[PDB]
Write a protein that binds this ligand. Structure first.
Ligand code: HEM
Ligand code: HEM
Lengths: 145, 145
């Protein structure tokens, strides 16, 4: 359950999330778009879910993709800001899950974002330690799908 | 159309938006909930769009309502952050409109948020000057609906 998964966010995990986000969240547009393009490159099968975005290969030049990418980063910002209060983190996660459940995005499908996050982190000198911390946060969302 | 509405966001307007947001955005949970509860109290009919939130009379104590309220504030955070670049502000606003268009929320309906905003601002001692600034930001969104 999402409640048990949120309890997996221990002291050090929350700390590593904040330290890495401090850098990653500094450039929401750049890292957000990098995140999306990496997802589409490593998992071409997910492109079907984003038909509305148009030609995703245009990257930054695609206004709809850029708008989506920037917005996506504010969802992560939201998560990070709610780390202090488990009750708030949970209600925010369930709220977020609504539209993804409606699009029929499964926990397994959502989990594909872990690869792109790991690669973006690595490009900023954040190793496995951080990728694993982010995988734990992603697991909270997966628990609600 | 959205670009034209964005043209109304002058240097002075953006300055008042940023200064007021520095305070309003410092307590997203408290002010986000205040915004929603004020909307429902002043325009009871808007509750018809939020059946999923359940018993909205519980206010802050309602996990779903609290989750929605906090999330709403990150959309405003997004907007404030993109003020200095019309191209990004526009793509984020159009991205935002997609789901509200699907919900059949007209520009007139959306405009009902102006009263609650004015009241929340006044609770923090921000006068008409600031209220007019926000009405202009809301107008950009209305142009997309
Ligand atoms: C770090 C993970 C992710 C975050 C934080 C995130 C964030 C968001 C946000 C904030 C929105 C806009 C609000 C909404 O419509 O719900 C959104 C839309 C969407 N998301 Fe997610 N998402 C993530 C991963 C995924 C994945 C892995 C998929 C699918 C494989 C997915 C599919 C969608 C789709 C199809 C849309 C609509 C895009 C559009 O038409 O504009 N998301 N997501
Ligand atoms: C400044 C004003 C507003 C902001 C920033 C805002 C922000 C948001 C955000 C970020 C979401 C979640 C993402 C999504 O599903 O689109 C949302 C959902 C929603 N909004 Fe808006 N919104 C505003 C005003 C309104 C108004 C005035 C109405 C209708 C009278 C409305 C109705 C809805 C509905 C029904 C949902 C889904 C709620 C749920 O079931 O969880 N919004 N809005």
């Amino acid at each position: 359950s999402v409640y048990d998964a949120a309890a997996q966010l221990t002291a050090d995990v929350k700390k590593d999330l904040r330290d890495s986000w401090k850098v990653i969240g500094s450039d929401k547009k750049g890292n957000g778009v990098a995140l999306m393009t990496t997802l589409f490159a490593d998992n071409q099968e997910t492109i079907g879910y984003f038909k509305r975005l148009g030609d995703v290969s245009q990257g930054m030049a695609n206004d709809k993709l850029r708008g989506h990418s920037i917005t996506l980063m504010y969802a992560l910002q939201n998560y990070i800001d709610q780390l202090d209060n488990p009750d708030d983190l949970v209600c925010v996660v369930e709220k977020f899950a609504v539209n993804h459940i409606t699009r029929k995005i499964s926990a397994a499908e959502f989990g594909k974002i872990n690869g792109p996050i790991k690669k973006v982190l690595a490009s900023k000198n954040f190793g496995d330690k951080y990728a694993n911390a982010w995988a734990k946060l992603v697991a909270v969302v997966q628990a609600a799908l």
